[PDB]
Write a protein that binds this DNA or RNA. Structure first.
Ligand SMILES: [Ca+2]
Ligand SMILES: [Ca+2]
Length: 298
DNA sequence: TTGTTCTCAGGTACCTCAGCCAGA
DNA sequence: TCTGGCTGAGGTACCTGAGAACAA
């Protein structure tokens, strides 16, 4: 049994709450004693361009594997002993997926019994149900019914959730009344299905600043005020693993706003910093760029 | 002339299942 | 009959922009 470092577990619990998945399944199976086979899996998905991150996990956790699916990759752990050992250690730090974790640990321990009785098996399948109910389940076929046949601790965890479900954005917004016809915009955002808004609300309390906004079926925590933002990113930046470049770039920009609102040179140079931030992001619908701002030649 | 609030939306990058096979 | 490595995809729940309007 490997013991995992607490700091590793804090960050990881956040990223897992963000991009991870804790899953239990009943596999239709003729060979199986009860025509069904239970699978338990922990997943971390990420764009293949960042599979190094998932490759790190394999090394740090020390078990599991990484697979590709064209554009997107996954870390996967289904081996039972190690899975229980890992989840046992991770669950105290989970906030969104903690109930799932614990249910998967219960199932794992009750296994030996489940396989030696039709009735014990059934009960266990009703835990798989529960887990699926907790997840954003949408394509599940085989169900049990079928079978009837401390500030550093918060910043480490918050870095994790931010590296996964969050976004550090910098924008150049076209505007007539602006001295150089464009307005700089910096934003820290965290996104979440509106049914977990209570979580983005918690952030407003813990961070001290910002607001939660709703739209369609999702909500955002957003932070755009130049001061608070600089304060926050200065604190949070040491603990980021995917978005550290973006965080610094935003701090470097904020520090050079003074001299940027003075000369068309500094302004256009700071615009290239915005370009770099979007390059680093998974940018897809960006319109106004620095080259655009180079119409300032007019 | 600037900062900020508040909502919307394109295009995925996730999540959460589905399943087959070889080995012991 | 059991376990773990490996593969495919449905349908969002995110990310990362956009811009109109309020408040200075
Ligand atoms: Ca998520
Ligand atoms: Ca992500």
């Amino acid at each position: 049994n490997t013991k995992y470092n607490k700091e590793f577990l804090l960050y990881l619990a956040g990223f897992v709450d963000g991009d991870g998945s804790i899953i239990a399944q009943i596999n239709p199976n003729q060979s199986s004693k009860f025509k069904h086979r239970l699978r338990l899996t922990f997943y971390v998905t990420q764009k293949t361009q960042r599979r190094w991150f998932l490759d790190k996990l394999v090394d740090e956790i020390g078990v599991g594997y990484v697979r590709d699916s064209g554009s997107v990759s996954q870390y996967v752990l289904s081996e039972i002993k190690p899975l229980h050992n890992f989840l046992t250690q991770l669950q105290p730090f989970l906030k969104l997926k903690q109930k799932q974790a614990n249910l998967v640990l219960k199932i794992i321990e009750q296994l030996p019994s489940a396989k030696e009785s039709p009735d014990k098996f059934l009960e266990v399948c009703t835990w798989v149900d529960q887990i699926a109910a907790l997840n954003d389940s949408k394509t599940r076929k085989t169900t049990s019914e079928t079978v009837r046949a401390s500030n550093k601790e918060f910043l480490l965890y918050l870095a994790g959730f931010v590296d996964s479900d969050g976004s550090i954005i910098a924008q150049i917004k076209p505007r007539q009344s602006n001295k150089f016809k464009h307005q700089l915009s910096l934003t820290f955002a965290v996104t979440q299905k509106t049914q977990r808004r209570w979580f983005l609300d918690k952030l407003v309390d813990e961070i001290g600043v910002g607001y939660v906004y709703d739209s369609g079926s999702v909500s955002d925590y957003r932070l755009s005020e130049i001061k608070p933002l600089h304060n926050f990113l200065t604190q949070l930046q040491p603990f980021l693993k995917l978005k550290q470049k973006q965080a610094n770039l935003v701090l470097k920009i904020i520090e050079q706003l003074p001299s940027a609102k003075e000369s068309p040179d500094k302004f256009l140079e700071v615009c290239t910093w915005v370009d770099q931030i979007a390059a680093l992001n998974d940018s897809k619908t960006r319109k106004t760029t620095s080259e655009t701002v180079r119409a300032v030649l007019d």
